[PDB]
Amino acid sequence: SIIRFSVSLQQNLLDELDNRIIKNGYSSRSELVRDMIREKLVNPNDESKIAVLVVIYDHHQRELNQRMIDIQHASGTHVLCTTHIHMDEHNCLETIILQGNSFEIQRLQLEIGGLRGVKFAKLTKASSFEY
Amino acid sequence: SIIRFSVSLQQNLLDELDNRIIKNGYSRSELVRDMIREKLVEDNWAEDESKIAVLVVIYDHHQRELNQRMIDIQHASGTHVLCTTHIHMDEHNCLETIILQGNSFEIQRLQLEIGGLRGVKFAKLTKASSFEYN
Amino acid sequence: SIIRFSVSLQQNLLDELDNRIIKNGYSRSELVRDMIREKLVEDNWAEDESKIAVLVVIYDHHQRELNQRMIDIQHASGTHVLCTTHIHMDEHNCLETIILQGNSFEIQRLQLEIGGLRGVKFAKLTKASSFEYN
Amino acid sequence: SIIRFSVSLQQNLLDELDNRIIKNGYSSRSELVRDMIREKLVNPNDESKIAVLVVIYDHHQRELNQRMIDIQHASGTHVLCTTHIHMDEHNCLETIILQGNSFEIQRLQLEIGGLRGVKFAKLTKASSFEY
Ligand code: NI
Ligand code: NI
Ligand code: NI
Ligand code: NI
Ligand code: NI
Ligand code: NI
């Protein structure tokens, strides 16, 4: 049977979801999101994997870089390298190359991802046996 | 502004959905957020135009002509490489993160072409859309 | 075109010069080449104008406000940061290579200012001049 | 007493030396170079040091990146990280962050520095006790 739950979205993502509802001919948020979920629905251990986090963050946010460096230092992952460029005057893009287990990597991602001024932290993992 | 809205779903699917919240570090609201972002970015990349992405490649530097080949592909693709970081992982494996600017076709093509080369063991693209950061 | 020319020198100084050829990996011609390049770059940086350099900094990330401080200094300097790479060396020490574009004053000032901060253990600039690469 | 030896310079460096002779009021190559040497003249061991090579190289030179990667891989130094950007359409700039002893580091520098298409390879070293 049919059940109704609540989702919370940041404005920028909501606006885009609303535009996609219109461009693609959906009738509601509920309907498109349902179709997305249904489509998605179609892991974690102690092994060391190499990973990459791609982080876009707000340039004007004070102390953000410091907070990221501290987290990287505090992490139980081994961060090999961080590289930063400016995309525009509002945004910087960073790649973090790191080694750790699935739990350590996921924690880093969510920690960085939840900081104010971080637009996203997207993860790429490669396990030994897939290279 | 985080905005609350409700979604309606069949219990059998809400149970499958809810089976993955903690597995993936998160509330239900957080896992669906990530699903939505992913699909909206895919959709954006499928349509209409200067995009940012990161290509992650793991490759064997012993393949004689591979790096120059990757460079030639990228030059002919029309994409701009903003920056590249390379880690010499071990005797064979190099990992690179290549920060790319261009049209979504050009960028996705560069990925496909590079992933097909002998010596390339891994090639995965991270896409970004301007609605995520403007 | 490598061009041969001769130089004249007092033996006591040619002996000191020649004492350092092998010590530094090189013929006499190679060690003097490097000396000349260095002085010519210094001279170029002293005069008259968009320059490229790399700043290398080793610093303690436990100094509370240091990274933001470095960022504020750099923003107020007028220099453009093209790219930054950071290595988390150990519990305290971070090494960064900061690729800079700007006037030689601005860039040299940024170095001096950063080298004076508590927590900064090392700050050394690599200068380039357009005669080296145009 | 006074002795006469030969130096060989790449054209771009010779041209610049000639311009400096004129701008600063020197009378000869021999005289300015002598004054440079005299000014300069006013080390290597097995300890691990952290170092950085800053390399500017010709973008159009084919197989150069490959040759650099191979050298970095073959080196007895531990190369932590390489980062590359384009300066212009003719030049790229790379930083190599590495650990090794003085002999290993110097060899890497000269190996990379002697490749066709490399405009320079400039070294920065920091020993443990100087940080
Ligand atoms: Ni290129
Ligand atoms: Ni490599
Ligand atoms: Ni190898
Ligand atoms: Ni900035
Ligand atoms: Ni650090
Ligand atoms: Ni620490």
Q: H or E segment at D97?
A: strand D91-100
Contact A80 D83 (CB under 8 A): no
A90-to-A64, A109, D16 alpha-carbon distances in Å: 13, 22, 40
Exposed, middle or buried, A7 (CB in 10 Å: 0-12/13-18/19+)?
buried
Q: H or E segment at D91?
A: strand D91-100
CATH architecture assignment, domain A9-42: Orthogonal Bundle (1.10)
Token pair 């933001």 in the structure block, residue: C68
Say which residues have a Cβ less than 8 Å from residue B115's Cβ, sequence separation at least 6.
B123
- How far is C-alpha C110 from the chain's CA centre? 12
Contact A33 B29 (CB under 8 A): no
Partnered with residue A123 across adjacent β-strands are A53
Rounded distance between C-alpha atoms, residue A53 and residue A16, angstroms: 23
Q: If DSSP states are collapsed to H, E and C, what string results for C55-104?
A: EEEEEECCCCCHHHHHHHHHHHHCCEEEEEEEEECCCCEEEEEEEEEECH
Partnered with residue C57 across adjacent β-strands are C96, C123
Contacts of C40 in chain D (CB under 8 A): 13, 16-17, 20
B13-to-A3, A7, D102 alpha-carbon distances in Å: 10, 15, 62
Exposed, middle or buried, A128 (CB in 10 Å: 0-12/13-18/19+)?
exposed
Q: DSSP string of B28-50?
A: HHHHHHHHHHHHHHHHHHH----
CATH number of the domain located at residue range(s) C45-134 in this protein: 3.30.70.1150
Decide: D82 and D93 in contact? Cβ < 8 Å. Answer: no
Q: DSSP string of D20-73?
A: HHHHHT-S-HHHHHHHHHHHH-----SS-EEEEEEEEEETT-TTHHHHHHHHHH
Domain-by-domain residue ranges, chain A?
Answer: 9-42, 43-131
Contact B35 A38 (CB under 8 A): no
Q: H or E segment at A58?
A: strand A49-58
**A44 secondary structure, DSSP code:** -
Rounded distance between C-alpha atoms, residue C25 and residue C75, angstroms: 40
Interface test with D, best of C80, C97, C111 (most D CBs within 10 A): C97
Reading the block at residue B58, the tokens are 């793991």
Kindly calculate the radius of gyration of chain B based on its CA atoms and give it in whole angstroms.
19
Token pair 């090794």 in the structure block, residue: D100
Contact B35 A37 (CB under 8 A): yes
Q: Outline where DSSP puts E strands in chain B.
A: 2-10, 51-60, 80-88, 93-102, 120-127
Rounded distance between C-alpha atoms, residue D50 and residue D124, angstroms: 9
Kindly calculate the radius of gyration of chain A based on its CA atoms and give it in whole angstroms.
18
CATH class assigned to A43-131: alpha beta
Query: Which residue of D66, D85, D86 is in closest CB contact with B67?
Result: D66
Q: H or E segment at D8?
A: strand D2-10
Interface test with A, best of C83, C86, C87 (most A CBs within 10 A): C86
Strand A49-58, strand A91-100: pairing: antiparallel
Decide: D130 and C56 in contact? Cβ < 8 Å. Answer: no
Which chain A residue has its CA at the smallest distance from C64's CA?
Answer: A66
Query: Which residue of A17, A24, A81 is in closest CB contact with B85?
Result: A81
Which chain A residue has its CA at the smallest distance from D83's CA?
Answer: A83
Residues whose CB is under 5 A from ligand 5 (ion)? A 69; C 61, 88, 94
| Smallest Cα distance from D89 to chain C, Å | 11
Say which residues have a Cβ less than 8 Å from residue C125's Cβ, sequence separation at least 6.
C53, C54, C55, C56, C107, C108, C111
Q: What per-residue string of b and e applies to C53-88 under the rule 16 or more CB within 10 Å gives b?
A: bbbbbbbbbeeeebbebbbebbeebebebbbbbbbb
- Is A83 an interface residue toward D (CB < 8 Å)? yes
Contacts of D86 in chain B (CB under 8 A): 81
- The resolution of the experimental structure, rounded to one decimal in Å, is 2.3
Nearest to D97 by CA among C98, C114, C102, A92: C98
Q: Is B88 annotated as a binding residue?
A: yes
Rounded distance between C-alpha atoms, residue D113 and residue D131, angstroms: 27
Contact B61 D73 (CB under 8 A): yes
- Is D69 an interface residue toward C (CB < 8 Å)? no
- How far is C-alpha D97 from the chain's CA centre? 15
Q: Which ligand is nearest to the CA of B71?
A: 1
Q: H or E segment at C120?
A: strand C120-127
Identify residue D117 by its one-letter amino acid code. G
Q: What per-residue string of b and e applies to D34-53 under the rule 16 or more CB within 10 Å gives b?
A: bebbeebeeeeeeeebbbbb
Interface test with D, best of A81, A84, A93 (most D CBs within 10 A): A81
Helix (H, G, I), strand (E, B) or coil at A95: strand
| Smallest Cα distance from A114 to chain D, Å | 28
Q: Is A60 annotated as a binding residue?
A: no
Rounded distance between C-alpha atoms, residue C58 and residue C124, angstroms: 9
**C134 secondary structure, DSSP code:** -
Q: Which ligand is nearest to the CA of D59?
A: 1
Query: Which residue of B61, B67, B81 is in closest CB contact with D86?
Result: B81
Contact D80 A83 (CB under 8 A): no
Contact A119 B132 (CB under 8 A): yes
Dihedral class, residue C54 (left if φ above 0, else alpha if ψ from -120 to 50, else beta): beta
Decide: B80 and B100 in contact? Cβ < 8 Å. Answer: yes
Rounded distance between C-alpha atoms, residue B16 and residue A38, angstroms: 10
Residues whose CB is under 5 A from ligand 6 (ion)? A 73; C 91
CATH number of the domain located at residue range(s) C11-44 in this protein: 1.10.1220.10
Contact D50 C89 (CB under 8 A): yes
Elucidation method: X-ray
Rounded distance between C-alpha atoms, residue A121 and residue C59, angstroms: 26
- Is C117 an interface residue toward D (CB < 8 Å)? no
Q: Residues of D comprising the binding site for Ni(2+)?
A: 73, 84, 86, 92
Identify residue B107 by its one-letter amino acid code. I
Q: Is B83 annotated as a binding residue?
A: no
Identify residue D31 by its one-letter amino acid code. E
- Is A34 an interface residue toward B (CB < 8 Å)? yes
- Is C87 an interface residue toward A (CB < 8 Å)? yes
Rounded distance between C-alpha atoms, residue B103 and residue B78, angstroms: 8
C5-to-C32, D18, D28, D30, D119 alpha-carbon distances in Å: 12, 12, 11, 8, 21
Rounded distance between C-alpha atoms, residue D63 and residue A65, angstroms: 37
- Is C81 an interface residue toward A (CB < 8 Å)? yes
Query: Which residue of C68, C83, C88 is in closest CB contact with A73?
Result: C88
| Smallest Cα distance from D81 to chain A, Å | 7
